[PDB]
């Protein structure tokens, strides 16, 4: 309850109006968890504040300082600075267990007994199954966690240059070891095998529980019509639908408080 | 040993040549185990007879027959014709288990330990990562099972209009349950996420034991080059090289044998 929650991580505004839309799908599907966001400085305040509002707790990493733990890091391996941002919600010790869910996902349906899962749970990754897609997965907040990853960081780096690549060399028996750590794929649907596998889609997709936008386009890069509500041109624009109700509904107006 | 084997499929001659390189593949990597494979009346004589060198037993089905079990079912949904020849695998019951493997597989080394497994286990497919990949599978041939099988294609056929469709959703407690039942991705290795997912396939797709060619272009379609061993124009034709050398060193020379 007070000690479990939803985390996500938010570097620009871009992605801050995807945690925004995150945060209030979570909320309208009625959690029982708290809500965690993960902010850098190039966030802006109006963001920010739009952030303080919809999560529980907004907390600000800095990778760039020298104060920061992965600073170090980042310095030898540069490219890695959001992979190093993200790890440090291992540091969150304030909770006992959370999942985390990148900021361009979307809540479809009430997903709290993911918390019933243990570290490290998460949904196979399309394209190689056998590696577990890092978009949404269950953890546990730990201070020895987290200096064993930012280590193997250090020394290994990561073989696809991001956080999937890092995470699963270190969660590395999940392909092979307990299936309840394989989480179904509707817990983190690639928004490409919907528009792609037509029939798997066809079969199990109305049971989706969350959508993982993937690709160049973010829901945020569409035009969407306000009065048909629906996305400018794409057999399922409905999922991109839902995320611009949202935002036109509950994001937008929350950001035009700060106008006054 | 006798009663254990690897089974494949051929309903044509183009796939033929893809069989005869498979069985090839296996006898080259020294399998213990018998080699089977399906045919029908439509694999020429010659092609029929390369079978018969390559593989232990060459079984005819004829589907087309009013006098095959699944004739009626193929009245029933046309579509079918090729599910309902490949379900015929299941009425081997001169086997105890068996490893299907469809005729556009290719063995890159010994998969003797997939007979360690039970029914059903197969490898995640991409795309759908909930769903096994029916190209490579572990089974128990039994008359009992292929009845229910062919039940299930009666009543409701398949999601995808293929094989697939119909076997996940008979063997649907695979994707939750006994993670023994999910073959490691490199014992069915999808050749799209080869030249696809570089950076998974650049860490992992060097202990690849099977190459699954997917995609409207077989192996087959390809022009191969005899002087530089490599076929034409993409960024792993590695694969590719070693189907047609095996096509070129034991399958060819061996089809003309029977021009004498």
Do not use: K, P
């Given at each position: 309850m007070t000690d479990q929650a939803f985390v996500t991580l938010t570097t620009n505004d871009a992605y801050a109006k995807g945690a925004l839309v995150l945060g209030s799908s979570l909320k309208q599907h009625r959690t029982s968890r708290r809500l965690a966001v993960l902010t850098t400085p190039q966030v802006s305040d109006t963001m920010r504040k739009a952030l303080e509002i919809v999560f529980d707790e907004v907390i600000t990493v800095d990778?760039?300082?020298?104060?920061?733990?992965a600073h170090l890091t980042l310095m030898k391996r540069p490219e890695l600075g959001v992979t190093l941002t993200k790890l440090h919600c291992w540091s969150l010790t304030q909770y006992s267990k959370c999942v985390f869910m990148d900021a361009d996902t979307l809540v479809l349906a009430n997903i709290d007994d993911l918390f019933e899962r243990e570290e490290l749970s998460a949904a196979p990754d399309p394209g190689w199954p056998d590696c577990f897609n890092s978009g949404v997965f269950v953890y546990q907040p730990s201070v020895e966690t987290y200096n064993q990853l930012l280590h193997v960081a250090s020394e290994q780096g990561s073989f696809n240059g991001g956080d999937q690549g890092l995470l699963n060399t270190f969660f590395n028996s999940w392909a092979t070891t307990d299936i309840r750590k394989h989480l179904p794929f509707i817990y983190n649907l690639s928004s490409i095998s919907i528009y792609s596998y037509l029939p798997a889609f066809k079969a199990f997709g109305a049971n989706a529980k969350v959508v993982h936008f993937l690709g160049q386009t973010k829901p945020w890069n569409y035009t969407y019509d306000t009065k048909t509500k629906s996305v400018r041109s794409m057999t399922h624009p409905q999922f991109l639908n839902v995320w611009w109700d949202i935002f036109t509904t509950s994001v937008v107006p929350l950001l035009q408080q700060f106008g006054l």
């Open positions: 990778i760039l300082d020298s104060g920061d733990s």
